[PDB]
Ligand binder design. Structure first.
Ligand SMILES: Nc1ncnc2c1ncn2[C@@H]1O[C@H](COP(=O)(O)OP(=O)(O)OP(=O)(O)O)[C@@H](O)[C@H]1O
Ligand SMILES: [Mg+2]
Lengths: 94, 301
């Protein structure tokens, strides 16, 4: 386990939001998502997007490890709403 | 019976001119219309003025307001504690660098404000729990830049006043134990009563109100904020049912432990926040297992 500033993840988005709820938009660069990793949260600025892969630049470095699964939330109408989950593949450590 | 006028009086710009010498040095900046629209955006979060093998989002840029905020930050020492009219982004601590509310640029303030539901409440629900039929007044929103201070943990207390009478004092971080509070219990009680009698009593815009204080390393009491005497304010170790009741809040005690009755009730935590960093939908193992199940069901739907 190390301290990571960037994360390379494989993500899976939901079709629509929870709670006919609105659909979930695709990941866009420079949007900040809420990232729930284990027992702590942090922000993630999207910096690269593929169909199943992505890179997020953390707004606050956390302690985790490769293979740990994460939760993703997006600011929707001034509320943090769950949009999907991910799993850490690679990371930039400091 | 909390009215909308009581909420207006607790705005920072309403009471700061009258209590400037007993609180933290602060700068109040009116919020420009386009900056207010930015903080009210209903889309995903993009921070303004941040400076392999899809869409690239950019936030609006406010050059004239960024330099105006930066000049106020420099006049306060280079580090500030940001608030809006009433609230601080206390629930957005997790997203900021080093989990700190200390801000050095407007970008730090933007990341906190647009990630905070307390800030969203200041915009969207300013007059909640109000009981009067009066129409909602027009709020002129403002950015409050307060000089950053290294506060000592366990030295903040919330004080409740009813008809200009200090009826109770409560430890503010009422979910955390601090040993030095019970050892200094009588000295803290006296310093808050002298502070209220000299600087707070008969000087605020209402009879019933709440005010938070901080006692520094030299014993001096500082004012932090004014809060409404209503359900919008967390009563901490007290309940509002007994605060409105104006009863014997001290409780059942013997003559060997009780002090004078003129003193208010002083409650602190004896020997013995989580939904902030979680989403509105809110063990992460069961959560992601629940996410796999819902994603497969939404594919069918
Ligand atoms: N200038 C400051 N520098 C550093 N920390 C501060 C400063 N002012 C306040 N704090 C800390 O932040 C906390 C919140 O401050 P404040 O009382 O202004 O918040 P608030 O948004 O009005 O909250 P509440 O919902 O309790 O009314 C304080 O209890 C204190 O620990
Ligand atoms: Mg307050």
């Amino acid at each position: 386990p190390e301290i990571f500033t960037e994360l390379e993840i494989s993500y899976f988005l939901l079709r629509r939001l929870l709670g006919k709820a609105a659909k979930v938009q695709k990941l866009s660069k420079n949007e900040v998502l809420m990232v729930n990793i284990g027992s702590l949260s942090t922000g993630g600025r999207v910096s690269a997007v593929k169909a199943d892969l992505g890179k997020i630049v953390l707004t606050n470095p956390v302690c985790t490890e490769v293979g740990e699964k994460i939760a993703l939330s997006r600011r929707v109408e001034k509320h943090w709403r769950l949009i999907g989950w991910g799993q850490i593949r690679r990371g930039v450590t400091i | 019976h909390m009215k909308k006028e009581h909420v207006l009086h607790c705005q920072f710009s309403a009471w700061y001119p009258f209590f400037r010498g007993v609180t933290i040095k602060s700068v109040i900046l009116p919020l420009p219309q386009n900056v207010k629209d930015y903080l009210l955006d209903d889309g995903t979060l993009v921070v303004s003025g941040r400076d392999w093998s899809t869409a690239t989002l950019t936030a609006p840029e406010f050059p004239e307001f960024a330099t105006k905020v930066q000049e106020a930050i420099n006049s306060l020492g280079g580090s500030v504690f940001p608030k809006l009219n009433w609230s601080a982004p206390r629930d957005a601590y997790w997203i900021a660098m080093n989990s700190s509310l200390k801000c050095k640029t407007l970008s730090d303030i933007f990341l906190l404000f647009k990630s905070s539901d307390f800030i969203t409440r200041d915009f969207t629900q300013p007059f909640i729990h109000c009981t009067d039929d009066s129409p909602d007044p027009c709020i002129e929103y403002e950015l409050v830049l307060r000089k950053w201070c290294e506060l000592i943990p366990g030295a903040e207390f919330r004080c409740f006043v009813k008809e200009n009478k200090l009826i109770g004092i409560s430890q503010r971080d009422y979910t955390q134990y601090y040993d030095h509070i019970s050892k200094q219990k009588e000295e803290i009680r006296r310093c808050i009563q002298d502070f209220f009698k000299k600087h707070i009593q008969y000087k605020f815009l209402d009879e019933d109100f709440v005010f938070d204080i901080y006692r520094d390393s030299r014993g001096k009491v500082w004012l932090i904020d004014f809060n409404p005497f209503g359900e919008v304010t967390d009563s901490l170790l007290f309940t509002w049912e007994e605060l409105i009741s104006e009863n014997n809040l001290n409780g059942d005690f013997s003559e060997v432990d009780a002090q004078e009755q003129d003193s208010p009730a002083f409650r602190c935590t004896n020997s013995e926040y989580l939904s902030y960093r979680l989403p509105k939908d809110f063990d992460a193992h069961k959560l992601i297992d629940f996410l796999k199940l819902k994603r497969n069901q939404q594919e069918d739907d």
